[PDB]
């Protein structure tokens with residue numbers, strides 16, 4: 001809008017995707033370091049991509065400390081640059097550098113607490129993220145963590161209608177999606193955060209399946225195979241098969257051994273089968289696990 | 303359950319209320335348009351109703367497109383020759399936002415009967431995006447209706463379809479409906495549908511949620527009741543045709559009430 005590519009000096013490449021290339025850059029007038037996402041409308045057989053239309057429209061209205069800020073959109077006839085607040089790293093890279101030491105319990109708790117704030121804000125503004133995974137959570141030097149990449153996000157109605165299927169990178173994908181359910185809701189974002197919570201503790205993916213059906217099976221072997229008692233309706237679901245192996249639910253202290261009683265409690269509520277009983281981000285913020293976080297809510301950006 | 307987001311429906315409703323005010327068109331833009339009229343807009347909307355039917359699009363998509371069009375025409379003056387180009391790009395942008403499977407650009411070129419080129423459609427897409435500054439997550443009548451529906455005791459499909467129908471009729475006629483917010487047209491539509499089908503009225507519980515009463519809804523309700531009574535006579539008939547379909551319970555075939563006692 002009031003931005004111009006002449007005000008930016010690129011610094012280095014920092015990422016890529018089907019979205020395109022991301023550069024770290026510097027505003028030569030203000031000093032501000034930004035990430036520029038370039039969307040080459042140059043290839044516009046179909047005009048502006050739907051992913052970009054959703055990303056931009058949805059990010060415009062989501063101002064929150066734990067959601068990456070879209071500062072500007074430069075709309076040339078050839079290209080589309082999204083100017084973002086810059087963050088030095090993502091959670092996946094940090095965990096790969098958190099070597100074996102691991103992430104200290106204070107920092108896990110801080111990160112999870114900020115992530116819930118961000119997500120609660122999204123749900124409160126009728127946005128599903130639909131791709132929460134560590135690669136899409138950015139951290140800064142000040143100890144903030146922020147939801148990023150809203151290319152797969154979506155504005156929902158209340159109640160929800162049927163949306164795109166097999167959304168969410170597979171390891172983070174909720175049972176209800178895997179079972180072809182007609183309707184999914186905010187509970188799918190919670191599942192992903194659940195998977196991510198576990199992953200911050202172990203530094204390993206909790207359900208790393210290599211197909212839809214393998215993904216289900218790994219979940220079932222961990223949380224037990226769901227039935228009508230734990231999850232009413234499950235056996236009626238489009239991709240539910242009676243032939244499914246019936247695994248017993250292992251005790252939850254075995255799923256993430258290092259985790260305390262409060263941690264286990266919160267994680268079990270995030271990974272509840274029944275989307276209706278799974279905890280909301282808003283309720284999870286009050287969970288006793290967070291009693292002793294005292295990292296200052298990070299501030300919003302301008 | 304979660305499909306109705308119990309923990310967020312109030313937050314969401316309050317947010318939609320704020321946004322509908324920001325996304326609102328200028329009530330009197332048509333008299334400032336030199337070359338187009340309410341009548342021409344009506345023809346365009348009616349046509350977009352047929353396009354959504356033909357391509358089996360969501361009703362939400364239709365509502366978003368009209369929102370885009372009305373906002374666009376609030377700041378950009380358009381020759382009658384180009385109105386359909388605005389509408390076409392609007393429908394495209396709405397489809398890319400709201401559809402799982404949007405029709406390709408070329409299908410949009412096709413429905414305009416080669417009045418315009420692919421290049422013209424994509425350039426108007428850009429202009430519309432510039433003009434709206436990419437603010438496309440607009441509240442619609444439907445987003446409100448669906449929440450209001452959660453207050454039916456118990457759910458009634460005839461009521462839900464009829465309300466949708468009446469809401470759609472309002473898209474056609476900028477006079478008077480530009481002067482009502484989506485949330486209010488939805489309230490009127492819901493009460494009228496409920497009354498027509500069951501004899502009941504706008505419930506207490508929606509007075510709690512919305513702050514609206516039959517009092518505050520009365521103006522809109524009187525208009526919507528006329529639009530309903532006259533709908534067989536309207537120049538534009540695509541919505542009545544659509545709502546004869548069983549998909550919508552054939553609700554266009556219900557008889558409007560002769561009085562509201564309001």
Ligand SMILES: COCc1cc(Br)ccn1
Pocket residue numbers: 014015022034035037068084085086087088089138148149
């Ligand atoms: C916030 O800066 C880091 C970043 C932003 C984006 Br968008 C993509 C990759 N990396």
